[model samples]
Target: MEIRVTEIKENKLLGRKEIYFEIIHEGEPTPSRKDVKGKLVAMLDLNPETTVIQYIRSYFGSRVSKGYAKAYESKERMFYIEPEYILIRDGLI
Candidate 1:
């Protein structure tokens, strides 16, 4: 699983960094959220506890996957700003 960071934007109001990335894995299936989150953590060199993998989408018959993620400045802000379902999905709670 190779990761290519497409964009990184700062949301001051949210106290986080939003990241858009693409995954290129030839002859491999779409990556799971946990897998992507781990990869993002390593790539950004940030705290896994404060990072959240928002979405991972794969196009039909394509080997690439597009994803969105956020790295929060603090876990407190993250829990407060993000939805409960999202927290559950990302295993933050």
Candidate 2:
């Protein structure tokens, strides 16, 4: 598995960072959020608790996976607002 960070934007006012990335893997199935979360924690050198997986999109018949995530400075410093559906799906709530 290879993780490529396509874009990283930080909002100082918001006290957090947004990430856009691509995952290149040829496994039987695309990697899951749990899998990518661990990789990003190591690859980006950020706190696992402060990082949230936003989404992962894989082309109809491709092995490339595109995704997004939000990284906060700390649990207390994190912004409370986020996509409602994702909050439930990712168990961030």
Candidate 3:
């Protein structure tokens, strides 16, 4: 799987950097939030402990998926507010 970051911006008010991205992979099922976060950690040279995979979405029969995630600058300040989606790629429930 390949991830291409399209938009990145800081949200001090929200305490994270909202990342809009696209993933392209042929002959493969849509990746899960864990998969996306792992790839993103390598692509951005980041650490998994500090990275968060907010979400990933794909349309029917499409090779490219578009979604958004957040990389928190301050883990303690993360805006997991209502947690509409998963926070850590892997964690205890």
Candidate 4:
């Protein structure tokens, strides 16, 4: 499965950012990270100036590993969870 970041939002009160994304799978909100047995396969940093393609490439290049690839292929899907707020492009999105 592939994930496409669609939007980002920040919550200063909670000190975290919410990242809205879409999974290229049959369902929405495909799965939760916890459902994957606590293994995080990959992650991406999404910025307003950053395209989904760029983020995905960078995530795969920096975070994916041989072990992760093997596990990822075996699983039907992956999960990604971001905090409720994040800093984007030197400002809140």
* Candidate with maximal lDDT: 1
Q: Can you write out model 3's per-residue Cα lDDT over 2-70, one digit (the tens) per residue? A: 899999988888767788899987788777777877888788876566466666776887768887767
Tens digit per residue, CA lDDT, model 2, 1-93: 789999999888878899999998875567778888788889989887777888888888876999898898776665365656766666556
Off by over 4 Å in 4: 26-41, 45-93
Better of 2 and 3 by lDDT: 2
lDDT values, one for every candidate: 0.90, 0.80, 0.70, 0.30
Q: Tell me, by TM-score, which candidate is best.
A: 1
- Least well predicted 10-residue stretch by lDDT in candidate 1: 23-32
lDDT of 4 by residue, 42-74 (tens): 454223221111121124434321111111111
Who is ahead in TM-score, 1 or 2? 1
Better model by TM-score: candidate 2 vs candidate 3? 2
Pairs with steric clashes in candidate 3: none
- List model 1 lDDT by residue over 1-93, tens digit each: 899999999999889999999988777776778888898899889798998888888888876889999999999999999998888999898
TM-score of each: 0.92, 0.81, 0.77, 0.33
Q: Any runs in candidate 2 off by more than 4 Å, and if so which? A: 77-79, 91-93
**Pairs that collide, model 1:** none
Please tell me which model should have the higher TM-score, number 3 or number 4: 3
- Per-residue lDDT, model 3, residue 37, is 75
